[PDB]
Amino acid sequence: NLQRDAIAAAIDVLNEERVIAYPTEAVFGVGCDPDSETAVMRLLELKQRPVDKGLILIAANYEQLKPYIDDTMLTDVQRETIFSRWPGPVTFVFPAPATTPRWLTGRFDSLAVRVTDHPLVVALCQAYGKPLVSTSANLSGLPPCRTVDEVRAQFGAAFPVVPGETGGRLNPSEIRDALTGELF
Amino acid sequence: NNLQRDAIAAAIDVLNEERVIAYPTEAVFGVGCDPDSETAVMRLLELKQRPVDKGLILIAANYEQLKPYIDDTMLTDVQRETIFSRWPGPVTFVFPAPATTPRWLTGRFDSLAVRVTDHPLVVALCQAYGKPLVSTSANLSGLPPCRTVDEVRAQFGAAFPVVPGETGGRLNPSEIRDALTGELFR
Structure with a gap:
């Protein structure tokens, strides 16, 4: 019920149109309700990232991502x-x-998307009912956080964060074009 | 006209036989066929000695005729x-x-290359046919394009089905852009 409780509070933050931190494969990530312009702008503001660069959606299964992409070709x-x-x-x-x-x-x-197998995120997305915008948990110019304590050190002791461990994976990010297969 | 009407009527009969037809375009004469028929298209590729992996161009009287073959949702x-x-x-x-x-x-x-032409004859033909036409230049491999009904007969045969009329006048040609960039494709 711990994870269940963690996901529940996580969903409350998401519904508040706010940003939340949680563990992913190699590092913790921060994310929000992809459907909310207010939430996404809060994430971009927090990361001081330009809106024109585009964001990544992480999900528990391909079905959750389909409404945001076009794979008909x-x-x-x-x-x-x-x-x-x-x-x-x-x-x-x-x-x-x-x-x-x-x-x-x-x-x-276009839109960058990923079907993750990280247990916590899969459970979170399954309960939330949709994908999450997902980027590395770090302030502009700072390195990604690998733990809850590191997230708190950069984002503040009261920053909303889902407990857990990353997948412990140190293979750099691999991004590919769906139409080619060529690294993006 | 009534001969254009008749010309179109016969052209549609050939198209329905899953056969290739010739007709004037804004450039020179072109040859085309029913895009929905694999048999008609293979007959055109064989005729042009063109490999199927290159892809073909669809010409239509309006954009709605092309929508079924493309994806513009992005x-x-x-x-x-x-x-x-x-x-x-x-x-x-x-x-x-x-x-x-x-x-x-x-x-x-x-992907697919397409065009909404302003050539009156082709516009009328596609409107009557109810769908776009695969369209390429009327020339056998290694030969110059035909500019008149007579040149088409010389190259494709005296009985090759050809719609009469005059070429638009616009010499040719073909600027090809990418719908995604608005710039030149390649």
Whole structure:
């Protein structure tokens, strides 16, 4: 019930249209309600990141991501190639419908997404009912946090953070284009 | 006219036989066929000695005729305005294409080159046909393009089905842009 309790409070923060920290594969990440422009702007403000660069969506399964992307051009063989890498630590850039909020796409007609296998995040997304905008937990110019204590050191002792351990993975970020397979 | 009407009627009969037809374009004469028929397209590729993996161009009387073969859902309203400001016209645009679009049209790509032409004859033909036409220049491999009905007969045969009329006048040609960038494709 600990994790259950942690996810519950986490959902409360998300519903408040606020940013929350939580463990991911290699480091902790910070994220929010992708559907809320106010929440996303709070995340960008916190990371001092320009809205035109675009954000990443992390989810428990591909179904949660589909409404934000357009995979209709991908042949069954291309899909098999992409999907063979999920769930996993691989982010894919997919074209995105014009209906997807520009605060997520940035100045592109695409969106970077990932189906994670990190247990905590999968549980969180499954309970929240949708994907989370997800980026590394760190202030501009600071290195990513690998623990709850490190998140508190950078973001403040009262910054909302889900307890747990990262996956303990030290393989750099791998981002690929869904249409090519080429590193993005 | 009534001969244009008749010319179109016979052209549609050939198209329905899953066969290739020739007709005037803004440039020189072109040849085309039913895009929905793998048999018709293979007949055109064989005729042009063109490999299927290159992809083909679709010409239509209006954008609605092309929508079924392409995916424009990612294009914002400003990008669309940028593309449309150039149609009808001599500009061809490459759009991503759903996996449902036949591979004998896309070639080895997940996109399709299309154009809303302003050539009256072709516009009328497509309007009557009810869908776009695969369209390429009327010339056998290694030969110059045909500019008149007579030149088409010399190259494709005296009985090759050809719609009469005059070429638009616009010499040719073809600027090809990417719907996603608005810039030149490649």
